[PDB]
Nucleic acid binder design. Structure first.
Ligand SMILES: [Mg+2]
Ligand SMILES: [Mg+2]
Ligand SMILES: [Mg+2]
Ligand SMILES: [Mg+2]
Ligand SMILES: [Mg+2]
Ligand SMILES: [Mg+2]
Ligand SMILES: [Mg+2]
Ligand SMILES: [Mg+2]
Ligand SMILES: [Mg+2]
Ligand SMILES: [Mg+2]
Ligand SMILES: [Mg+2]
Ligand SMILES: [Mg+2]
Ligand SMILES: [Mg+2]
Ligand SMILES: [Mg+2]
Ligand SMILES: [Mg+2]
Ligand SMILES: [Mg+2]
Ligand SMILES: [Mg+2]
Ligand SMILES: [Mg+2]
Ligand SMILES: [Mg+2]
Ligand SMILES: [Mg+2]
Ligand SMILES: [Mg+2]
Ligand SMILES: [Mg+2]
Ligand SMILES: [Mg+2]
Ligand SMILES: [Mg+2]
Ligand SMILES: [Mg+2]
Ligand SMILES: [Mg+2]
Ligand SMILES: [Mg+2]
Ligand SMILES: [Mg+2]
Ligand SMILES: [Mg+2]
Ligand SMILES: [Mg+2]
Ligand SMILES: [Mg+2]
Ligand SMILES: [Mg+2]
Ligand SMILES: [Mg+2]
Ligand SMILES: [Mg+2]
Ligand SMILES: [Mg+2]
Ligand SMILES: [Mg+2]
Ligand SMILES: [Mg+2]
Ligand SMILES: [Mg+2]
Ligand SMILES: [Mg+2]
Ligand SMILES: [Mg+2]
Ligand SMILES: [Mg+2]
Ligand SMILES: [Mg+2]
Ligand SMILES: [Mg+2]
Ligand SMILES: [Mg+2]
Ligand SMILES: [Mg+2]
Ligand SMILES: [Mg+2]
Ligand SMILES: [Mg+2]
Ligand SMILES: [Mg+2]
Ligand SMILES: [Mg+2]
Ligand SMILES: [Mg+2]
Ligand SMILES: [Mg+2]
Ligand SMILES: [Mg+2]
Ligand SMILES: [Mg+2]
Ligand SMILES: [Mg+2]
Ligand SMILES: [Mg+2]
Ligand SMILES: [Mg+2]
Ligand SMILES: [Mg+2]
Ligand SMILES: [Mg+2]
Ligand SMILES: [Mg+2]
Ligand SMILES: [Mg+2]
Ligand SMILES: [Mg+2]
Ligand SMILES: [Mg+2]
Ligand SMILES: [Mg+2]
Ligand SMILES: [Mg+2]
Ligand SMILES: [Mg+2]
Ligand SMILES: [Mg+2]
Ligand SMILES: [Mg+2]
Ligand SMILES: [Mg+2]
Ligand SMILES: [Mg+2]
Ligand SMILES: [Mg+2]
Ligand SMILES: [Mg+2]
Ligand SMILES: [Mg+2]
Ligand SMILES: [Mg+2]
Ligand SMILES: [Mg+2]
Ligand SMILES: [Mg+2]
Ligand SMILES: [Mg+2]
Ligand SMILES: [Mg+2]
Ligand SMILES: [Mg+2]
Ligand SMILES: [Mg+2]
Ligand SMILES: [Mg+2]
Ligand SMILES: [Mg+2]
Ligand SMILES: [Mg+2]
Ligand SMILES: [Mg+2]
Ligand SMILES: [Mg+2]
Ligand SMILES: [Mg+2]
Ligand SMILES: [Mg+2]
Ligand SMILES: [Mg+2]
Ligand SMILES: [Mg+2]
Ligand SMILES: [Mg+2]
Ligand SMILES: [Mg+2]
Ligand SMILES: [Mg+2]
Ligand SMILES: [Mg+2]
Ligand SMILES: [Mg+2]
Ligand SMILES: [Mg+2]
Ligand SMILES: [Mg+2]
Ligand SMILES: [Mg+2]
Ligand SMILES: [Mg+2]
Ligand SMILES: [Mg+2]
Ligand SMILES: [Mg+2]
Ligand SMILES: [Mg+2]
Ligand SMILES: [Mg+2]
Ligand SMILES: [Mg+2]
Ligand SMILES: [Mg+2]
Ligand SMILES: [Mg+2]
Ligand SMILES: [Mg+2]
Ligand SMILES: [Mg+2]
Ligand SMILES: [Mg+2]
Ligand SMILES: [Mg+2]
Ligand SMILES: [Mg+2]
Ligand SMILES: [Mg+2]
Ligand SMILES: [Mg+2]
Ligand SMILES: [Mg+2]
Ligand SMILES: [Mg+2]
Ligand SMILES: [Mg+2]
Ligand SMILES: [Mg+2]
Ligand SMILES: [Mg+2]
Ligand SMILES: [Mg+2]
Ligand SMILES: [Mg+2]
Ligand SMILES: [Mg+2]
Ligand SMILES: [Mg+2]
Ligand SMILES: [Mg+2]
Ligand SMILES: [Mg+2]
Ligand SMILES: [Mg+2]
Ligand SMILES: [Mg+2]
Ligand SMILES: [Mg+2]
Ligand SMILES: [Mg+2]
Ligand SMILES: [Mg+2]
Ligand SMILES: [Mg+2]
Ligand SMILES: [Mg+2]
Ligand SMILES: [Mg+2]
Ligand SMILES: [Mg+2]
Ligand SMILES: [Mg+2]
Ligand SMILES: [Mg+2]
Ligand SMILES: [Mg+2]
Ligand SMILES: [Mg+2]
Ligand SMILES: [Mg+2]
Ligand SMILES: [Mg+2]
Ligand SMILES: [Mg+2]
Ligand SMILES: [Mg+2]
Ligand SMILES: [Mg+2]
Ligand SMILES: [Mg+2]
Ligand SMILES: [Mg+2]
Ligand SMILES: [Mg+2]
Ligand SMILES: [Mg+2]
Ligand SMILES: [Mg+2]
Ligand SMILES: [Mg+2]
Ligand SMILES: [Mg+2]
Ligand SMILES: [Mg+2]
Ligand SMILES: [Mg+2]
Ligand SMILES: [Mg+2]
Ligand SMILES: [Mg+2]
Ligand SMILES: [Mg+2]
Ligand SMILES: [Mg+2]
Ligand SMILES: [Mg+2]
Ligand SMILES: [Mg+2]
Ligand SMILES: [Mg+2]
Ligand SMILES: [Mg+2]
Ligand SMILES: [Mg+2]
Ligand SMILES: [Mg+2]
Ligand SMILES: [Mg+2]
Ligand SMILES: [Mg+2]
Ligand SMILES: [Mg+2]
Ligand SMILES: [Mg+2]
Ligand SMILES: [Mg+2]
Ligand SMILES: [Mg+2]
Ligand SMILES: [Mg+2]
Ligand SMILES: [Mg+2]
Ligand SMILES: [Mg+2]
Ligand SMILES: [Mg+2]
Ligand SMILES: [Mg+2]
Ligand SMILES: [Mg+2]
Ligand SMILES: [Mg+2]
Ligand SMILES: [Mg+2]
Ligand SMILES: [Mg+2]
Ligand SMILES: [Mg+2]
Ligand SMILES: [Mg+2]
Ligand SMILES: [Zn+2]
Lengths: 118, 131, 59, 122, 14, 204
RNA sequence: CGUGAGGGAAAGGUGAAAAGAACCCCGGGAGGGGAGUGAAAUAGAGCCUGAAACCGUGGGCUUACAAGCAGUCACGGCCCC
RNA sequence: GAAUGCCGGCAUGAGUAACGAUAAAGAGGGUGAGAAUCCCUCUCGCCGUAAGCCCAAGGGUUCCUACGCAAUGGUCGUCAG
RNA sequence: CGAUGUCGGCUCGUCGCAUCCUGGGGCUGAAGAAGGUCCCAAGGGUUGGGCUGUUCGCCCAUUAAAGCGGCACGCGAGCUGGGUUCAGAACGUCGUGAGACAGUUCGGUCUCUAUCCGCCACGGGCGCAGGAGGCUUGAGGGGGGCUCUUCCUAGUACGAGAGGACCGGAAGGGACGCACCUCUGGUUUCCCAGCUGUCCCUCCAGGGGCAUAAGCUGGGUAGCCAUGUGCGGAAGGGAUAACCGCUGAAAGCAUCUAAGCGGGAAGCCCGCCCCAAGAUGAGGCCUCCCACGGCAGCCGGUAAGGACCCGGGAAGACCACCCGGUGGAUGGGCCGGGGGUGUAAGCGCCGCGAGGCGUUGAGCCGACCGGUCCCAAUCGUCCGAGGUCU
């Protein structure tokens, strides 16, 4: 049973999944868009949204909060300076996931893109 | 439909609103209506509230006292109609929300850990300077 | 346990009867509105990168 | 929540101090005694010259317990020990007094002597 | 297969 | 013999004569009758109740014509009530008074594939003293050459829950007709949000 | 294979002649399709003949209320000659 | 037609068990007919009296570089002992 | 004998009835209570311990009672392996000996993959002469079925007394079963806090990794849960067992019987809960589409409808099931509440300092109750009646 339970496992233990999400966050925030499996994408959405939102708050406390997951003063500076302001009026929904048509050759996995919106 | 709202609605006719706020660590006296066949009297119970678990109308707090050599704890519904009143006897300062640990503590050792909360005692006297 | 084992060889009729549920179901396909190419629904078109009416990626 | 092999502190001045429950007198196959139930028990430790002595197979009413007791009014009460009072076949205290609080459940169960002898009825 | 795995010992029917 | 369709809202507890009374809140009414079963037409008696109004955007033509034959706005569910035939075209909580005793049927929570221990309260095996990978196992399931088979109805692992269950003789604690709410003492099958039927009790 | 003494296999055949398939097409290749050689190419080198188990495609009859060492005897139906 | 016969071949079990330590992965870029699996960069995890380095035995070209991917590699492979 | 694993235990039961208990009876050397003995009855129930490998048995403490048997002395492709039943070793005993022993003693490898039947679950297919969406009858199955104490009647009947009822009426339990999570109590793998060592970011402050597949510790929501809560055993109708009769001959009397009728059990039938029209005997009712185009047949294009694909779900192994798909609150975000934690960071003040105080119930914050189209359920596709004959 799994009733009313939130959160995919992604076949990783408690610290691997987290490093997975943090690394996915850095890469997406860095490149603007990335390709993952569809399940990992859906879980990244909220993981990144929160950080983008904390950046909109702007305060020092938010910056330190974010640096726990992102750890890159430069990229957190990019988050607060160039990414955060283009969302000032967007009440959530800072990312989107669109499925791709073809799967990998070697394990058949379905893929999708995660991107920051406009 | 808002199932949460309806539940609060059933609860509202029983929701109590005449009881002083308290916290874990506070010493407190609960005046409790008890039946003793076939009459009903008011039995007092005075101790440290060591636990308060919140679920709206269903909140319940746990009070600990030492009684004639034996440690006794009692749980009360915070909105029970059986509580005459709650008298605040002492505002103590705890650093966590559940004080289960005080059970394995000596008398003076508890005295140390739950020193008087001057800040909420100054409030205790500030209010009650009323019209 | 004690190493269970097939007591008899499965007949050609029984072998294949078990495979009565083994056919592939063909892929669900829909034409792409922009370039009229057949592609699975709810995916970005891999022949023109159009989805929801707009170009979403280079092909 | 007392069961066979449970040790109970002895709450009177019978001379006993510890007893080990060997049976819950509550029908065929009751699993646990609470406050108010009777148990047969063996005296595992008693002080010298007491009306009860080590080895005696006595009866007892459980006056207070470590597992909380729930109540129709929605409240509960929990003690720091499991305690018992040694009784006779008429369910009367063999001792001359009771030490400590006892559970109010004892009153409406016909253990009125022990409830009076009790310093506190909680 | 020049190596034959030795058979398991029988259940003792004595 | 009266019935009504409802939705399990949640559990709480009230206070009544200085007693904690655990109750389940059921949002019962209002239930429009959609079709009456007659011995002439069907061989038995019943009223097919309707419950929870539905967006016509989703109600197909065969059912729209069914509702229309009753002058009822399309509703989400229909369920009959055997041997019950009210006077109006609407059935509400007001058919139940406090102190009455009801029978509640709901769809039980779904355990899915359940082990022999959870479903059948089998004792399993030991956890030490040599047990070999059988700690949650059923044990034996038969004899030997006689009968050389396993009984029908033998208790084994398999899907458990998500089935129709009925709880008998539930006291009615309060009726709040303006919010269409039924307060019943005790527990009702299944999850909050799930559909239930509240009938008069068959006990005495 | 065995430290060693020692043990100890499997594996023959295009065609008369290489005339052993230029060149073109699909293909990364492998393979194939044409062209061409030959009396013959399901003699194309994984090559004479090419059985059987075994695997598959196509067609006729047949089968989802039925009890079976699978056949046999009878009658009926459908398809073929 | 049987010798748990001998040699060979092909079935069944079956698209089943398994794919060999639970130190662990993610992205971006490049190459290529083809990329989870090769190269590059960033991020993450593992060892650190070692899972790092130097000898001896044993192994015998496996070293380095170019060109390759039929087979070998428990998948894939453009990579490789 | 080209192998049918052997004791006891554990697990899971199922049947018998020569019945341990509970129900119904006759007789009694049955006053009452409580027994005896036999009859009927297999529905349910039939406890926990000490000793021993034990089965068996004795003992302790209870109980309504602590029943006896069959199923390869039920059950090792379900477990165990203490005993038996290999090789070691020792004692007693026998034997010159090697060795022996229903003599003893300590130790001594129990085989990952289920093909067929059977079984628990779950689908796919076809069928139920038109095609569909709903709601249903219940043939037939299955589940359940236990019992105690106290009290009123009443210290009455009975009894010299002790003792102590029938019938009838209350209340409260044990064990079991189904469901549930409000309370009580668990868990809650990253929801919060505190702590050590080390490495790091960025020097301070603040943080991150690792110490487990949570480093450790104090807590802890939803969910899943029992130790917790609700509820069930029936009632009642019917037909009977033994047993007791009414009326009544054969057979002037008598006779429960031969004609006929009544009473009578925890048992049988029904009632209750659950499955259930593949019930091929394929049931019923409501509503929807409808005489299509071309040669009981064939191929088309549709209708009502359906599926595919998608967002999801206290539904779930896959499948199935249920909700939703922009005329939309389905998931993710965002916002409010609830809830956990227990007063963040930064700054100011105090102290040489560890710290302390204030700002501040602050900061953080999964799942719960809702709100809001900010992001994704874009766009579509394929099936799908024309109704055989008497
Ligand atoms: Mg699990
Ligand atoms: Mg969810
Ligand atoms: Mg895994
Ligand atoms: Mg995996
Ligand atoms: Mg870790
Ligand atoms: Mg978040
Ligand atoms: Mg998409
Ligand atoms: Mg796809
Ligand atoms: Mg690949
Ligand atoms: Mg096994
Ligand atoms: Mg075995
Ligand atoms: Mg094993
Ligand atoms: Mg198995
Ligand atoms: Mg095996
Ligand atoms: Mg075949
Ligand atoms: Mg065949
Ligand atoms: Mg088969
Ligand atoms: Mg298969
Ligand atoms: Mg198929
Ligand atoms: Mg002693
Ligand atoms: Mg002694
Ligand atoms: Mg004491
Ligand atoms: Mg051999
Ligand atoms: Mg072998
Ligand atoms: Mg229902
Ligand atoms: Mg269960
Ligand atoms: Mg259980
Ligand atoms: Mg267990
Ligand atoms: Mg073992
Ligand atoms: Mg095993
Ligand atoms: Mg184990
Ligand atoms: Mg199990
Ligand atoms: Mg056997
Ligand atoms: Mg048989
Ligand atoms: Mg189900
Ligand atoms: Mg060699
Ligand atoms: Mg050699
Ligand atoms: Mg030749
Ligand atoms: Mg030649
Ligand atoms: Mg020639
Ligand atoms: Mg030649
Ligand atoms: Mg080319
Ligand atoms: Mg070629
Ligand atoms: Mg070709
Ligand atoms: Mg060619
Ligand atoms: Mg010729
Ligand atoms: Mg030929
Ligand atoms: Mg030839
Ligand atoms: Mg020749
Ligand atoms: Mg040939
Ligand atoms: Mg050939
Ligand atoms: Mg051939
Ligand atoms: Mg064929
Ligand atoms: Mg039939
Ligand atoms: Mg047929
Ligand atoms: Mg036959
Ligand atoms: Mg004939
Ligand atoms: Mg022969
Ligand atoms: Mg042969
Ligand atoms: Mg054989
Ligand atoms: Mg062979
Ligand atoms: Mg074959
Ligand atoms: Mg083979
Ligand atoms: Mg094979
Ligand atoms: Mg498979
Ligand atoms: Mg298999
Ligand atoms: Mg498998
Ligand atoms: Mg294997
Ligand atoms: Mg596998
Ligand atoms: Mg392995
Ligand atoms: Mg590997
Ligand atoms: Mg591996
Ligand atoms: Mg680690
Ligand atoms: Mg990454
Ligand atoms: Mg890569
Ligand atoms: Mg690759
Ligand atoms: Mg590749
Ligand atoms: Mg590389
Ligand atoms: Mg070191
Ligand atoms: Mg070390
Ligand atoms: Mg050398
Ligand atoms: Mg070598
Ligand atoms: Mg190279
Ligand atoms: Mg290769
Ligand atoms: Mg290759
Ligand atoms: Mg290749
Ligand atoms: Mg080559
Ligand atoms: Mg290989
Ligand atoms: Mg390979
Ligand atoms: Mg390998
Ligand atoms: Mg290449
Ligand atoms: Mg190299
Ligand atoms: Mg034999
Ligand atoms: Mg054999
Ligand atoms: Mg044999
Ligand atoms: Mg054998
Ligand atoms: Mg038996
Ligand atoms: Mg009998
Ligand atoms: Mg009897
Ligand atoms: Mg009797
Ligand atoms: Mg008598
Ligand atoms: Mg008798
Ligand atoms: Mg019985
Ligand atoms: Mg029996
Ligand atoms: Mg016993
Ligand atoms: Mg024992
Ligand atoms: Mg002992
Ligand atoms: Mg023992
Ligand atoms: Mg014994
Ligand atoms: Mg014995
Ligand atoms: Mg008796
Ligand atoms: Mg046996
Ligand atoms: Mg037995
Ligand atoms: Mg056995
Ligand atoms: Mg075994
Ligand atoms: Mg055995
Ligand atoms: Mg067996
Ligand atoms: Mg066997
Ligand atoms: Mg042994
Ligand atoms: Mg052993
Ligand atoms: Mg001797
Ligand atoms: Mg001698
Ligand atoms: Mg011997
Ligand atoms: Mg003997
Ligand atoms: Mg000895
Ligand atoms: Mg040893
Ligand atoms: Mg031994
Ligand atoms: Mg084997
Ligand atoms: Mg099978
Ligand atoms: Mg098979
Ligand atoms: Mg068979
Ligand atoms: Mg079906
Ligand atoms: Mg039908
Ligand atoms: Mg029936
Ligand atoms: Mg049948
Ligand atoms: Mg009286
Ligand atoms: Mg008299
Ligand atoms: Mg009575
Ligand atoms: Mg809870
Ligand atoms: Mg809750
Ligand atoms: Mg709790
Ligand atoms: Mg977190
Ligand atoms: Mg941590
Ligand atoms: Mg650190
Ligand atoms: Mg620092
Ligand atoms: Mg590190
Ligand atoms: Mg490390
Ligand atoms: Mg914890
Ligand atoms: Mg806890
Ligand atoms: Mg929780
Ligand atoms: Mg009768
Ligand atoms: Mg007579
Ligand atoms: Mg007469
Ligand atoms: Mg007669
Ligand atoms: Mg009669
Ligand atoms: Mg009964
Ligand atoms: Mg039904
Ligand atoms: Mg049907
Ligand atoms: Mg049906
Ligand atoms: Mg039939
Ligand atoms: Mg799903
Ligand atoms: Mg739909
Ligand atoms: Mg659509
Ligand atoms: Mg929504
Ligand atoms: Mg939402
Ligand atoms: Mg929220
Ligand atoms: Mg909040
Ligand atoms: Mg709040
Ligand atoms: Mg709060
Ligand atoms: Mg502060
Ligand atoms: Mg601060
Ligand atoms: Mg600070
Ligand atoms: Mg200073
Ligand atoms: Mg808070
Ligand atoms: Mg709106
Ligand atoms: Mg389209
Ligand atoms: Zn396109």
């Amino acid at each position: 049973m799994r009733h009313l339970k939130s959160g995919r496992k992604l076949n990783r233990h408690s610290s691997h999944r987290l490093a997975l999400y943090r690394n996915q966050a850095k890469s997406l925030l860095t490149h603007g868009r990335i390709t993952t499996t569809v399940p990992k994408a859906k879980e990244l959405r909220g993981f990144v949204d929160h950080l983008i939102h904390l950046a909109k708050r702007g305060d020092l406390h938010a910056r330190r909060l974010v640096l726990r997951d992102l750890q890159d003063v430069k990229l957190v500076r990019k988050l607060f300076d160039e990414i955060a302001p283009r969302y000032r009026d967007r009440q959530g929904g800072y990312t989107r996931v669109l499925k791709l048509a073809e799967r990998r050759r070697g394990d058949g996995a379905p893929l999708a893109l995660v991107e920051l919106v406009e | 439909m808002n199932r949460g709202a309806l539940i609060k609605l059933v609860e509202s006719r029983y929701v109590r609103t005449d009881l002083p706020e308290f916290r874990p660590g506070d010493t407190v006296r609960v005046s409790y209506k008890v039946k003793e066949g076939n009459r009903t009297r008011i039995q007092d119970f005075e101790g440290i509230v060591i636990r308060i678990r919140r679920n709206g109308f269903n909140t319940t707090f746990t009070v600990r006292k030492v009684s004639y050599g034996v440690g006794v704890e009692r749980i009360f519904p915070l909105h029970s109609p059986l509580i005459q009143k709650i008298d605040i006897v002492q505002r103590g300062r705890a650093r966590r929300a559940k004080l289960y640990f005080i059970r394995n503590l000596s008398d003076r050792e508890i005295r140390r850990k739950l020193r008087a909360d001057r800040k909420r005692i100054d409030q205790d006297r500030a209010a009650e300077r009323a019209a | 346990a004690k190493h269970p084992v097939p007591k008899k060889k499965t007949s050609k009729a029984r072998r294949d009867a078990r495979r009565s549920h083994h056919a592939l179901t063909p892929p669900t396909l829909v034409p792409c509105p922009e370039c009229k190419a057949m592609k699975p629904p709810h995916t970005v078109c891999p022949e023109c990168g159009y989805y929801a009416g707009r170009k979403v990626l280079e092909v | 929540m007392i069961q066979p092999q449970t040790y109970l502190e002895v709450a009177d001045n019978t001379g006993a101090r510890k007893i080990m429950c060997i049976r819950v007198l509550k029908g065929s196959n009751a699993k646990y005694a609470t406050v108010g139930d009777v148990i047969v028990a063996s005296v595992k430790e008693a002080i010298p010259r007491g009306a009860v002595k080590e080895g005696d197979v006595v009866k007892a009413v459980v006056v207070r317990t470590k597992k909380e007791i729930k109540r129709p009014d929605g409240s509960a009460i929990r003690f720091d020990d499991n305690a018992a009072v040694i009784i006779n076949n008429q369910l009367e205290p063999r001792g001359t007094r009771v030490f400590g609080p006892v559970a109010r459940e004892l009153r409406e169960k016909g253990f009125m002597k022990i409830v009076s002898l009790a310093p506190e009825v909680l | 297969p020049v190596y034959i795995p030795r058979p398991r010992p029988p259940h003792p029917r004595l | 013999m009266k019935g009504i369709l409802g939705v399990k809202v949640g559990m709480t507890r009230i206070f009544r004569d200085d007693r904690a009374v655990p109750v389940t809140v059921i949002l019962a009414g209002p239930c429009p009758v959609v079709q009456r079963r007659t011995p002439e037409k069907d061989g038995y008696t019943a009223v097919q109740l309707g419950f929870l109004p539905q967006n016509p955007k989703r109600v197909n033509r065969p059912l729209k014509g069914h509702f229309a034959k009753a002058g009822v706005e399309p509703v989400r569910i229909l369920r009959e009530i055997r041997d019950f035939n009210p006077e109006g075209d609407t059935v509400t909580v007001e058919i139940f008074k406090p102190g009455e005793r009801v029978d509640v049927t709901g769809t039980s929570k779904g355990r899915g594939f359940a082990g022999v221990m959870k479903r059948w309260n089998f004792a399993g095996g030991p956890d030490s003293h040599g047990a070999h990978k059988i700690h949650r196992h059923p044990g034996s399931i038969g004899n030997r050459k006689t009968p050389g088979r396993v009984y029908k109805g033998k208790k084994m692992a398999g899907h458990y829950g998500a089935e129709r269950v009925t709880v008998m003789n539930l006291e009615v604690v309060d009726v709040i007709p303006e919010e269409n709410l039924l307060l019943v003492k005790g527990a009702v099958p299944g999850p909050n949000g799930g559909l239930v039927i509240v009938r008069e009790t068959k006990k005495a």
